[PDB]
């Protein structure tokens, strides 16, 4: 209870003593902060251009790290609303703070009474909502803003799969929850595990915690939000359990820049990312400390306790009279707190709020106005969250709509080297991230920056199926096969005319194979074909020169001409059916087939007709010319109408071959000549064969006549069986893979065999010598 005059009175709650009130002068926490508050008030009342003639007053009470004691004191604040009675004060703002769950309770009791309250040290995420704390402002970063630093650094280093660790308190739980929530929304990071310790661990607990963190050897980032016991005991109990070089630690101030947690556990904590609230050094207030005497500070009720506990003398034991002694040399090691700047900033913000309210409510009139006499709570709260000023550090102090303060942290890193063991500054976090990546050193099992990704980007051509529920993880599967590889998750089929590339991705044309001119199957047919076209040509040459000569007289008639033409055409098609297929070749092959088949058989039938039926015009010229021209014209028109013969149209078997291995699958350059087309084409040939067979069965009972007409029948009979053998060897070739090879060989050889039989008893031995 400190009474300082004033015209606008404020209040102050401070943690003098410790956890009704136990006796331990908390010193740094309490006394320092009281002196800071009174100091800042003292320079507020001197600045001529801050609040004009208005003066400030102060009502400083005590809290002993208890919630209820602070409740009684906050009741003491509000007592002007309830014979030498003195006028009570009128508090227009409360400026006090401590560990949380104290600011919470005073915030409730003060929001019930529309009194603003600005805190300097209370940093609890639960105190970050307008509901239930509409009147609570804060001039220090929330601890939830610390969880935005770990997320940013984890994203910056590329880690997406981490393991969180915490302690059972209101600190660890809230910090881990904020880390999880920021990890959500903005994605890119995943949490493998979340292990929370108890307040008191049973024997072996740390071993189980370590081994369950060691269960998944892919998450090697441990974001610890937990007090010193976890640090010390996890880093020491991992020595003989051998997780060294397997976990990288990122911790909050609970670890901080301290060296006490690990006295020698340095090889288990060879790397760390530590976040600390920024710090300053107030010069005028240190002077205030240095100028405080005993005859001056009668303003402090509990200041003799400071004299007794800061030097060890019980004035009321060294029993020293204590004379007069400045508190630097005769005092023990001296240092101030880091939170004095915030308790100065709070009172400055409140004074600025009052000044800004004066600017509007009471214009021009120096001092006060009756309108301004009552300091309305709502207007003051509105003006408090409207200040953008800077003081006592050179750094700005401002509040968002919630009333919190922007967070300014710094980041330290821990490594070792010969003679070097320190906490280098790798950067900071003031509404953004600033990391000196090249400054970081992880020189224990990781030469470059370490890795914690759940899965690793694969080679192209291996479809990566993201496992459901965890984008940070996936599993790669080969997409080899006829299907092409399009995207990371997309690989669909490429067209059958595109063999999939041997590069495990891409597609290319299938090679096309064709019956080759030089092959171990076509050489013997072309050879026998040319052998035939030599001997047959020789005989034809013999006949024509000697048409009138006896014995060859029957040969002189054009019947022999037509038979020879048919034989030569058969041989020609035998040769041509071998060479490489082309756009129009096969149509020519078909026309030649029709032509030769008509010629030879028509000659055979007309000769048989002339020979036999005449036993009951007969002359060779008349009969032959008519029938030959007629039948040739018939087949000529049959060819002309392009029903059996195909157009230049062809087929390429790019993908018709169904080989499981694309590589060895091939194709053929096949004219689209159907087997039914072949059968119907030779149908007229079959009819001629049937007619000639009937005629020669009639001849079988041959009249005496001559002897040259029986070989005609015999040769035709042999050719009948020779050609009938073809049909089974036409149908049976479809089963084999080399359908084209066997089909072409059998057709060509069967034609050559029929031709050679016609070259037999028909006209060879009759002219052995002519």
Ligand X SMILES: N[C@](CC1c2ccccc2Oc2ccccc21)(C(=O)O)[C@H]1C[C@@H]1C(=O)O
Q: According to CB under 6 A, which one of 136, 161, 171, 179 is a site residue for ligand X?
A: 171
Beta carbons within 8 Å of 451's beta carbon, 6+ residues apart: 158, 159, 220
Q: Is 171 annotated as a binding residue?
A: yes
Apex 181 CA angle, 177 and 186, nearest 5: 155
Q: Is 123 annotated as a binding residue?
A: yes
- Residue 62, both tokens: 């005590």
Count of Cβ atoms closer than 10 Å to residue 119 Cβ:
29
Strands (E), 396-554: 396-397, 408-417, 420-430, 433-435, 462-466, 474-478, 499-500, 507-508
Residue 126's binding partner, choosing from ligand X, its own copies, none, with beta-carbon cut-off 5 to 8 A by kind?
A: none
Q: How far is the CB of 41 from its own copies (least distance, A)?
A: 25
Q: How far is the CB of 506 from ligand X (least distance, A)?
A: 59
What is d(CA 437, CA 449) in angstroms, rounded to the nearest whole number?
Answer: 9
Helix, strand or coil, per DSSP, at residue 499: strand
Over the window 175 to 214, marking each residue x when it contacts ligand X by CB under 6 A and - when it does not, the resulting string is: ----------------------------------------
Segment contacting ligand X (CB under 6 A): 98-106, 510-518, 596-604, 642-650?
Answer: 98-106
Q: According to CB under 6 A, which one of 124, 147, 162, 351 is a site residue for ligand X?
A: 124
Q: According to CB under 6 A, which one of 63, 100, 349, 746 is a site residue for ligand X?
A: 100
For residue 430, the cross-strand partners are 408
Residue with tokens 């760390």, as numbered in its chain: 272
Segment contacting ligand X (CB under 6 A): 95-103, 261-269, 368-376, 538-546?
Answer: 95-103
The DSSP code sequence of 262-293 is: -SS--SSSS-EEEEEE-----HHHHHHHHH--
Asked if 121 interacts with ligand X (CB under 6 A), we say yes
Query: Smaller CB distance to its own copies: residue 112 or 531?
Result: 112
Query: Smaller CB distance to its own copies: residue 20 or 260?
Result: 20
Residue 132's binding partner, choosing from ligand X, its own copies, none, with beta-carbon cut-off 5 to 8 A by kind?
A: its own copies
Residue 113's binding partner, choosing from its own copies, ligand X, none, with beta-carbon cut-off 5 to 8 A by kind?
A: its own copies
Residues at the interface with its own copies (CB under 8 A): 71-72, 75-76, 78-79, 81-82, 105, 108-109, 112-113, 132
Query: Smaller CB distance to ligand X: residue 119 or 628?
Result: 119
Q: Residue 180's closest CA among 155, 209, 151, 158? A: 151
How far, in Å, are 524, 536, 689, 752 from residue 531 at the CA level? 10, 9, 26, 10
How far, in Å, are 11, 86, 107, 361, 381 from residue 74 at the CA level? 9, 20, 10, 29, 19
Long-range contact set of residues 548-557: C-beta below 8 Å, sequence gap at least 24: 549/770, 551/766, 551/767, 551/770, 552/767, 552/770, 554/708, 555/763, 555/767, 557/620, 557/621, 557/624
Count of Cβ atoms closer than 10 Å to residue 319 Cβ:
8
Residue with tokens 């035939």, as numbered in its chain: 532
Q: Is 339 annotated as a binding residue?
A: yes
Q: How far is the CB of 122 from ligand X (least distance, A)?
A: 5
Q: Would strands 190-196 and 161-166 be described as parallel, antiparallel, or unpaired? A: parallel
Q: Is 253 annotated as a binding residue?
A: yes
Q: Residue 131's closest CA among 107, 115, 148? A: 107
Q: Residue 351's closest CA among 323, 327, 375? A: 375
Asked if 168 interacts with ligand X (CB under 6 A), we say no
Beta carbons within 8 Å of 278's beta carbon, 6+ residues apart: 408, 409, 410, 428
What is d(CA 124, CA 99) in angstroms, rounded to the nearest whole number?
Answer: 9
Segment contacting ligand X (CB under 6 A): 121-129, 198-206, 542-550, 699-707?
Answer: 121-129
- Residue 667, both tokens: 């194709």
Residue 265's binding partner, choosing from its own copies, ligand X, none, with beta-carbon cut-off 5 to 8 A by kind?
A: none
Asked if 18 interacts with ligand X (CB under 6 A), we say no
Q: How far is the CB of 243 from its own copies (least distance, A)?
A: 43
Query: Smaller CB distance to its own copies: residue 107 or 397?
Result: 107
Asked if 170 interacts with ligand X (CB under 6 A), we say yes
Q: How far is the CB of 9 from its own copies (least distance, A)?
A: 18
Query: Smaller CB distance to ligand X: residue 74 or 123?
Result: 123
Residue 121's binding partner, choosing from ligand X, its own copies, none, with beta-carbon cut-off 5 to 8 A by kind?
A: ligand X
Count of Cβ atoms closer than 10 Å to residue 342 Cβ:
25
Residue 100's binding partner, choosing from ligand X, its own copies, none, with beta-carbon cut-off 5 to 8 A by kind?
A: ligand X
Asked if 122 interacts with ligand X (CB under 6 A), we say yes
Residue 171's binding partner, choosing from ligand X, its own copies, none, with beta-carbon cut-off 5 to 8 A by kind?
A: ligand X
Contacts to ligand X from residues 316-335, by CB under 6 A: none
Residue 71's binding partner, choosing from its own copies, ligand X, none, with beta-carbon cut-off 5 to 8 A by kind?
A: its own copies
**Per-residue three-class SS string for 348-361:** HHHHHHHHHHHHHH
Segment contacting ligand X (CB under 6 A): 118-126, 147-155, 482-490, 701-709?
Answer: 118-126
Q: According to CB under 6 A, which one of 99, 104, 304, 678 is a site residue for ligand X?
A: 99
Task: Please give the backbone phi and psi of residue 755, each rounded to the nearest 5 degrees, phi first.
Answer: -65, -45
Count of Cβ atoms closer than 10 Å to residue 185 Cβ:
6
Q: How far is the CB of 70 from ligand X (least distance, A)?
A: 13
Query: Smaller CB distance to ligand X: residue 405 or 598?
Result: 405
Query: Smaller CB distance to its own copies: residue 111 or 589?
Result: 111
- Where is 249: in which H helix or E strand? strand 248-251
Residue 170's binding partner, choosing from its own copies, ligand X, none, with beta-carbon cut-off 5 to 8 A by kind?
A: ligand X
Q: How far is the CB of 29 from ligand X (least distance, A)?
A: 6
Q: How far is the CB of 236 from ligand X (least distance, A)?
A: 20
Q: How many residues does the chain have?
A: 770
Query: Smaller CB distance to ligand X: residue 100 or 148?
Result: 100
Radius of gyration (C-alpha) of the chain in whole angstroms: 56
Q: How far is the CB of 133 from its own copies (least distance, A)?
A: 13
Q: According to CB under 6 A, which one of 123, 415, 587, 750 is a site residue for ligand X?
A: 123
Beta carbons within 8 Å of 105's beta carbon, 6+ residues apart: 67, 70, 71, 74
Residue 105's binding partner, choosing from ligand X, its own copies, none, with beta-carbon cut-off 5 to 8 A by kind?
A: its own copies
Query: Smaller CB distance to ligand X: residue 127 or 639?
Result: 127
What is d(CA 245, CA 269) in angstroms, rounded to the nearest whole number?
Answer: 9
Apex 175 CA angle, 171 and 179, nearest 5: 170
Q: Is 352 annotated as a binding residue?
A: no
Residue 253's binding partner, choosing from ligand X, its own copies, none, with beta-carbon cut-off 5 to 8 A by kind?
A: ligand X
Residue 108's binding partner, choosing from its own copies, ligand X, none, with beta-carbon cut-off 5 to 8 A by kind?
A: its own copies
Q: Residue 469 burial by CB count (10 A; 0-12/13-18/19+): exposed, middle or buried? A: exposed
Q: Provide the annotated binding site.
A: 100, 121-123, 171, 253, 339
Annotated binding-site residues for L-glutamate read 100, 121-123, 171, 253, 339
Binding site for ligand X (CB under 6 A): 98-100, 121-124, 143, 170-171, 227, 253-254, 339
């Amino acid at each position: 209870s400190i009474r300082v005059d004033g015209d606008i009175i404020l209040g102050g709650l401070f943690p003098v003593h410790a956890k009704v009130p136990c006796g331990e002068l908390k010193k740094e926490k309490g006394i320092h902060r009281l002196e800071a508050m009174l100091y800042a008030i003292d320079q507020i009342n001197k600045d001529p251009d801050l609040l004009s003639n208005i003066t400030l007053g102060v009502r400083i009470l005590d809290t002993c790290s208890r919630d209820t004691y602070a409740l009684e004191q906050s009741l003491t604040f509000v007592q002007a609303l309830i014979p030498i009675f003195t006028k009570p004060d009128k508090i227009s703002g409360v400026i006090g703070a401590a560990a949380s769950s104290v600011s919470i309770m005073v915030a409730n009791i003060l929001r019930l009474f529309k009194i603003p309250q600005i805190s300097y040290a209370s940093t609890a995420p639960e105190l970050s909502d307008n509901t239930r704390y509409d009147f609570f402002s804060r001039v220090v970063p929330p601890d939830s803003y610390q969880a935005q630093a770990m997320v940013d650094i984890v994203t910056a280093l590329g880690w997406n799969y981490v393991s969180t660790l915490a302690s059972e308190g209101n600190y660890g739980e809230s910090g881990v929850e904020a880390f999880t929530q920021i990890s959500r929304e903005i994605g890119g990071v995943c949490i493998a595990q979340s292990q929370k310790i108890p307040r008191e661990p049973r024997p072996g607990e740390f071993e189980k915690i370590i081994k369950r963190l060691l269960e998944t050897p892919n998450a090697r980032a441990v974001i610890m939000f937990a007090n010193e016991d976890d640090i010390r005991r996890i880093l020491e109990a991992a020595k003989k359990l051998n997780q060294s070089g397997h976990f990288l630690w990122i911790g909050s101030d609970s670890w901080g820049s301290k060296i006490a947690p690990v006295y020698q556990q340095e090889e288990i904590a060879e790397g760390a990312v530590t976040i600390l609230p920024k710090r300053a050094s107030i010069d005028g207030f240190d002077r205030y400390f240095r100028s405080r005497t005993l005859a001056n500070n009668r303003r402090n009720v509990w200041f003799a306790e400071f004299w007794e506990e800061n030097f060890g003398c019980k004035l009321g034991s060294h029993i020293k009279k204590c004379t007069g002694l400045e508190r630097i040399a005769r005092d023990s090691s001296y240092e101030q707190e880091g939170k004095v700047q915030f308790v100065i900033d709070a009172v400055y913000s409140m004074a600025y709020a009052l000044h800004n309210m004066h600017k509007d409510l009471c214009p021009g009139y120096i001092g006060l106005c009756p309108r301004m006499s009552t300091i309305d709570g709502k207007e003051l709260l509105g003006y408090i969250r409207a200040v953008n000023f800077n003081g006592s550090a050179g750094t700005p102090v401002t509040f968002n709509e919630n009333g919190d303060a922007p967070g300014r942290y710094d980041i330290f890193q821990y490594q070792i080297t010969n003679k070097s063991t320190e906490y280098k500054v790798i950067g900071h976090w003031t509404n953004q991230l600033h990391l000196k990546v090249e400054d970081m050193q992880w020189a224990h099992r990781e030469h470059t920056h370490p890795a914690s990704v759940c899965s690793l980007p694969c080679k192209p051509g291996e479809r990566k199926k993201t496992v459901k529920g965890v984008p940070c993880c996936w599993h790669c599967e080969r997409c080899e096969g006829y299907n092409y590889q399009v995207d990371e998750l997309s690989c669909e089929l490429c067209p059958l005319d595109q063999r999939p590339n041997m590069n495990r991705t891409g597609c290319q044309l299938i090679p096309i194979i064709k019956l080759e001119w030089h092959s171990p199957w076509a050489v013997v047919p072309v050879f026998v074909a040319i052998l035939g076209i030599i001997a047959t040509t020789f005989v034809i040459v013999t006949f024509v020169r000697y048409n009138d000569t006896p014995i060859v007289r029957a040969s002189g008639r054009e019947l022999s001409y037509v038979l020879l033409t048919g034989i030569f055409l058969c041989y020609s098609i035998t040769f041509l059916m071998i060479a490489a297929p082309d756009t129009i070749i096969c149509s020519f092959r078909r026309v030649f087939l029709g032509l030769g088949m008509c010629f030879s058989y028509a000659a055979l039938l007309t000769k048989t007709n002339r020979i036999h039926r005449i036993f009951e015009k007969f002359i060779s010229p008349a009969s032959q010319l008519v029938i030959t021209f007629s039948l040739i014209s018939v087949q000529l028109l049959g060819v002309f109408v392009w029903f059996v013969v195909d157009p230049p149209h062809i087929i390429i078997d790019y993908g018709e071959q169904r080989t499981l291995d694309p590589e060895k699958a091939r194709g053929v350059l096949k004219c689209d000549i159907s087997d039914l087309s072949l059968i119907c084409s030779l149908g007229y040939s079959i009819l001629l064969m049937v007619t000639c067979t009937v005629y020669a069965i009639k001849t079988r009972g041959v009249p005496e006549t001559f002897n040259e007409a029986k070989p005609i029948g015999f040769t035709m009979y042999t050719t009948c069986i020779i050609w009938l053998a073809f049909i089974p060897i036409f149908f049976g070739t479809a089963q084999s893979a080399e359908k084209m090879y066997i089909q072409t060989t059998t057709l060509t050889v069967s034609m050559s065999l029929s031709a050679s039989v016609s070259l037999g008893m028909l006209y060879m031995p009759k002219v052995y010598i002519i």
